[PDB]
């Protein structure tokens, strides 16, 4: 009663700026949920409006929904998935079970997006012939990040990766940087046949090149949101999908509780210490 | 060189360190002074990165910017003219003599007690040189009713 | 290699059925991705594939979209955002900021779209009239879930329920639980104008209608999706957007540790026990 | 059947050094779990056994569980204290409710211990004098980590501190890190 008449000042300790609900109707970064659905963007729409707060050009958009489908799943026997199926098999929920896979995402295990993507952007903006980035990255004992498969090599090539290149050269109106990986691309398959761009190294050169080629973003605005982890938040938000889809799979296949085998392990402990 | 008139309702200034009350105490002076903008266009905390720090215009909530480096300051602010200087007794010799190479810094508020007499000559010979006015070192500031106030002068509202 | 020619035979502790990825091509239950790709569903569409694994039809999918858009933020005053946030002020990546807010989802917070959906197919399948589940609730000393908004009540509808309602009316071939939800909110409406029907109990009575009344699910079928809590997965998923979206807005306006008042906590510690 | 008999060779993928469980006994890094509990090891005794895998000293043994009664809480304000009563209060379980507040211990939270011990060790280690230190962190613009109270300042000290610090003067045989970050 005090404050709404205005005789006391309280700091807010919060501030916010991705969505506001006290209000008539529900908004999304300024746009009403109306709006939203009158003007028919999906996913990757509404993906714009509360990552970026930006109104993304429909193409933009539609590549964040493909992005989310080729990251959705890839099978149980990585990291994350194999978590979230032991975790479902000791009988949690699906919250639990999704967060105990999920927490495996970070560098070993879904961070070669973002990894990538400020691997190329660092050799791009500190500008760097591609045959100059390849010696550069040897001599320093590093593997380029996004490059290299394990079986589909080269005239049998990944297939993620073509629909997602198909698409990115047709929409796009300019690609420097996937027309720099590509060139990497280029080198590394003179080396072996399998050191090609993976669907990892393909989103994180393609995903820069829709911030900074899109006009929503300033180029300040777009090295902010790839120095964050925007492209984090694509592998994350995409793999949660099979993740669940992993959780329900084992609920309905009535899967027990697993113990690993002791076989399998190897054990090692000191003689009395 | 030194000038007349100090402070007006005009007035910008940049304040070095973290003094969120002494800040909150010249934008509430400001707004009761019926200014048009605040005083405090930045603040340099060199132990923080560049964020900004919520402040009040009156009842309305609005960000000042807080600076690592006072260079940055500087540039992105080329109307502030005034630089407070909170930095304790054995800091505030060299945020002063930094701050002097900037030219449009006219006036120095050294609020520090401690300084070496040693020390504060070489920033009087240097304000001599630069034209600069330097009220301090060892004081609250000053007040210029309607216009300008510096850091904690006159108390509260 | 005595595996491979077939001396030895091992028991596989391990059984999937939503993703085949040790082959030529990524396969998402039995539809390769690029046959996923030409057939232009969505992300809807792949969220049929990994969590049911069926072919749904095209308004099957694109209303599991339109659910993830309507459920993708609420603001941050709710519990899951609160503690995304605090998370992401205390300087943590964005899969610990996610998962410190996506861990809140459960019974109080999130779970009205799985409640209802359980409690309003428990009344139509043990069939009984919309006035008498009203009057069996109320002698329960419970109240009905998905049923009641705190300012949108009638003539002032929920904008979210009347795009979802107007989508279901259109495409869905038969709403019978859609249809019992509503006449459930016709006498509720009665008593007070703000017990409609929510964007949560509108979920709940059309997912469950999506599911038995599409074609691509059995009875039995569709009642074991909700009863392992594929509805769950729809709220989790689609908060999860909002949550990353308020990670990223925490580290763009570079929020500081945050810790909470002490005049907001009350402290009521014994005297010497 | 063929493994037990040896005719095949399976790789194990996973390797351990802390606790033996497939056997008659319980054993924690070599040592049976009777034999921990006939020496009188308490929890801090079966932390050096699990995590560094060593017999320690009685007197490091029970640093060890006094450092982990003085870091129990500090209140609810804290951030992850905070993130387990909201979580609580939205009707989840000692699981979860644990784990939502326990996530958000990192850098800003919880950080300072292992921040401070990196901190002072490097400056021990590359052996420069207290004095150097506080100059050589000040022109670097980093404030030193395990320095700075809010409202315990001198003549009014912490008492976590001097319950911690005169157990360790006591009972160490070799302070030379405590002794560099009390000059510092
Ligand atoms: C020698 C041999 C075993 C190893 O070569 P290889 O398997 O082709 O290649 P490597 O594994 O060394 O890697 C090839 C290059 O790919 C590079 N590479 C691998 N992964 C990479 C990644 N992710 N990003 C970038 N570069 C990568 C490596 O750095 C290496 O670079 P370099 O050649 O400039 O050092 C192979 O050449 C061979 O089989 N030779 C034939 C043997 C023979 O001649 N015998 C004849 C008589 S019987
Ligand atoms: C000027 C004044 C406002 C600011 O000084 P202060 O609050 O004592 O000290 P600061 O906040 O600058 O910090 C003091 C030192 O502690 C250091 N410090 C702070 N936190 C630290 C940490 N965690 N680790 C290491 N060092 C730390 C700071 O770097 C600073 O170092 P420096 O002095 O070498 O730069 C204060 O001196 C003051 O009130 N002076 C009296 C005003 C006056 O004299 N007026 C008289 C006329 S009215
Ligand atoms: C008496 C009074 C204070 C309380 O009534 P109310 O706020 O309208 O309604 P209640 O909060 O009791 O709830 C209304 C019904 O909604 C039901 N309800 C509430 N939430 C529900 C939910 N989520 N699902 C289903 N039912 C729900 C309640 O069970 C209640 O049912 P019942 O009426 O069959 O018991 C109100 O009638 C009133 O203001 N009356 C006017 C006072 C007056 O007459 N004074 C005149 C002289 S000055």
Same mark, same amino acid.
């Given at each position: ?8 000042? #309280? ?81 949690? &929920? ?41 010696? #550069? ?28 290149? =198909? ?32 669907? &990892? ?7 820069? =090149? ?64 | ?157």
């Amino acid at each position: 009663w005090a404050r709404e008449l205005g005789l006391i000042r #309280k700091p807010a300790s919060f501030m916010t700026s991705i969505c506001d609900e006290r209000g008539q109707e529900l908004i999304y970064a300024g746009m009403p949920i109306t709006e939203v659905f009158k003007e028919e963007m999906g996913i990757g729409g509404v993906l714009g409006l509360l990552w970026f707060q930006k109104r993304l050009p429909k193409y933009s958009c539609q590549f964040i929904e493909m992005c989310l489908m080729v990251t959705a799943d890839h099978g149980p026997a990585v990291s994350g998935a194999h978590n979230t199926i032991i975790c479902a098999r000791a009988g949690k &929920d699906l919250v639990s079970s999704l967060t105990s896979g999920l927490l495996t995402i970070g560098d070993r295990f879904g961070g070669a997006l973002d990894a990538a993507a400020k691997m190329f952007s660092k050799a791009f903006d500190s500008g760097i012939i591609p045959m100059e980035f390849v010696n #550069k990255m040897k001599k320093e004992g590093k593997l380029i990040m996004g490059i290299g498969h394990r079986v589909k090599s080269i005239n049998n090539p990944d297939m993620r990766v073509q629909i997602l290149k =198909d698409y990115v050269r047709q929409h796009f109106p300019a690609t420097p940087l996937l027309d720099y990986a590509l060139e990497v691309e280029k080198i590394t398959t003179s080396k072996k046949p399998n050191l090609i761009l993976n669907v &990892d190294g393909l989103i994180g050169v393609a995903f820069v =090149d829709m911030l900074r080629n899109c006009g929503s973003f300033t180029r300040e605005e777009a090295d902010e949101y790839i120095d964050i982890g925007a492209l984090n938040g694509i592998f994350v938000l995409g793999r949660s999908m099979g993740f669940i889809g992993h959780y329900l799979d084992q609920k309905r296949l009535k899967q027990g509780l697993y113990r690993h085998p002791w076989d399998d392990i190897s054990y090692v402990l000191p003689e009395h210490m | 060189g030194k000038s007349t008139t100090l402070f007006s309702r005009h007035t910008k200034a940049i304040v070095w360190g973290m003094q969120t009350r002494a800040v909150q105490g010249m934008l509430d002076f400001d707004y009761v002074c019926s200014r048009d903008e605040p005083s405090v266009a930045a603040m340099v905390y060199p132990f923080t990165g560049d964020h900004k720090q919520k402040f009040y215009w009156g009842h309305k909530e609005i960000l000042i910017p807080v600076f690592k480096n006072m260079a940055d300051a500087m540039r992105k602010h080329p109307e502030v003219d005034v630089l407070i200087n909170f930095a304790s007794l054995r800091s505030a010799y060299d945020s002063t003599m930094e701050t002097m190479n900037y030219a449009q810094i006219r006036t120095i508020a050294i609020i520090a007690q401690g300084i070496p007499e040693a020390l504060t000559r070489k920033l009087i010979k240097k304000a001599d040189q630069k034209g600069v006015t330097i009220i301090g070192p060892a004081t609250v500031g000053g007040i210029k009713p309607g216009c300008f106030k510096i850091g904690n002068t006159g108390g509260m509202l």
